[PDB]
Design an enzyme around this catalytic site. Sequence first.
Site, PDB file in Angstrom:
ATOM      1  N   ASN A  45       7.981 -13.117  23.559  1.00  0.00           N
ATOM      2  CA  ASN A  45       8.722 -13.038  22.272  1.00  0.00           C
ATOM      3  C   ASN A  45       9.676 -11.854  22.330  1.00  0.00           C
ATOM      4  OD1 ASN A  45       7.676 -12.442  18.760  1.00  0.00           O
ATOM      5  ND2 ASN A  45       9.439 -13.643  19.522  1.00  0.00           N
ATOM      6  N   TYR A  85      17.466 -11.963   9.393  1.00  0.00           N
ATOM      7  CA  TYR A  85      16.047 -11.699   9.450  1.00  0.00           C
ATOM      8  C   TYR A  85      15.681 -10.359   8.828  1.00  0.00           C
ATOM      9  CZ  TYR A  85      11.791 -10.276  12.170  1.00  0.00           C
ATOM     10  OH  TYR A  85      10.557  -9.836  12.566  1.00  0.00           O
ATOM     11  N   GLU A  94       7.749 -11.668   6.429  1.00  0.00           N
ATOM     12  CA  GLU A  94       8.781 -11.760   7.490  1.00  0.00           C
ATOM     13  C   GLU A  94       9.688 -12.913   7.061  1.00  0.00           C
ATOM     14  OE1 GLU A  94       7.393 -13.056  11.389  1.00  0.00           O
ATOM     15  OE2 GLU A  94       8.773 -11.698  12.399  1.00  0.00           O
ATOM     16  N   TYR A  96      13.466 -15.374   7.398  1.00  0.00           N
ATOM     17  CA  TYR A  96      14.500 -15.902   8.252  1.00  0.00           C
ATOM     18  C   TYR A  96      15.481 -16.805   7.513  1.00  0.00           C
ATOM     19  CZ  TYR A  96      11.350 -15.299  12.379  1.00  0.00           C
ATOM     20  OH  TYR A  96      10.498 -14.848  13.369  1.00  0.00           O
ATOM     21  N   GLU A 184      16.427 -14.147  18.058  1.00  0.00           N
ATOM     22  CA  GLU A 184      15.031 -14.125  18.464  1.00  0.00           C
ATOM     23  C   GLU A 184      14.809 -15.161  19.564  1.00  0.00           C
ATOM     24  OE1 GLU A 184      11.957 -14.740  15.477  1.00  0.00           O
ATOM     25  OE2 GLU A 184      10.451 -13.992  16.778  1.00  0.00           O
TER      26      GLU A 184
HETATM   27  O1  LIG Z   1      10.052  -5.040  14.472  1.00  0.00           O
HETATM   28  C1  LIG Z   1       9.051  -5.821  15.093  1.00  0.00           C
HETATM   29  C2  LIG Z   1       9.120  -7.233  14.473  1.00  0.00           C
HETATM   30  O2  LIG Z   1      10.394  -7.624  14.137  1.00  0.00           O
HETATM   31  C3  LIG Z   1       8.371  -8.143  15.445  1.00  0.00           C
HETATM   32  O3  LIG Z   1       8.329  -9.429  14.906  1.00  0.00           O
HETATM   33  O4  LIG Z   1       7.052  -7.721  15.556  1.00  0.00           O
HETATM   34  C4  LIG Z   1       6.621  -6.463  15.209  1.00  0.00           C
HETATM   35  C5  LIG Z   1       7.614  -5.460  14.642  1.00  0.00           C
HETATM   36  O5  LIG Z   1       7.379  -4.141  15.024  1.00  0.00           O
END
Ligand SMILES: O[C@@H]1[C@@H](O)[C@H](O)OC[C@H]1O
Length: 207
Positions: A45, A85, A94, A96, A184
């Site tokens: 990732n 994001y 989180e 998107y 990403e």
């Molecule tokens: O900034 C990083 C984030 O965007 C990622 O998804 O996983 C952990 C975080 O520290």
Amino acid sequence: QIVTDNSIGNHDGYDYEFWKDSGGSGTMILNHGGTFSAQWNNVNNILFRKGKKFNETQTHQQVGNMSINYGANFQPNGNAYLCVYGWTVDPLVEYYIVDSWGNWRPPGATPKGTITVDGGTYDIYETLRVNQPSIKGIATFKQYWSVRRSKRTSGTISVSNHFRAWENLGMNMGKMYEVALTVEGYQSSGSANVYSNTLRINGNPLS
Ligand SMILES: O[C@@H]1[C@@H](O)[C@H](O)OC[C@H]1O
């Protein structure tokens, strides 16, 4: 201004971040303003981004209207996203807004609604991450998504419109931690040249 390992900083007024887990490689070249180039190979990732990090004290309404005008030459080989994001805290979310992708249209869930904005139609989704790395440690948190119905790699993303659509659907948002134009990758390789990326807050470009 060459970043090939985890790093958080400010470059030419933008808060930049390079993040990956172990496996494969990536290279981010920090260019003027909000711009940058990215290359990744055989990652698990990886995320590359330039935007604004906030001090976790304001709702998106308090921050103000957020809008990103961007352009990117996006060449993924496999699973990758070209998006806006970021995160909120309390609750930890989180999020998107995906304008383009590679071989897989994310995020694999049943849509909860749709939003029309910026000349596109986006499907809205909510997913759950369980004991995964986050900005606040290994945690269980929701992900909020808007995913365009067809791909585009330049234009304007009216970020605050998506936030209002999400809140309309009961997708609770916390205090702002970040908003950024992001690439990403997941179990993939590729390149992206982000040649244009301006974040305006209440119409004022970041500096
Ligand atoms: O900034 C990083 C984030 O965007 C990622 O998804 O996983 C952990 C975080 O520290």
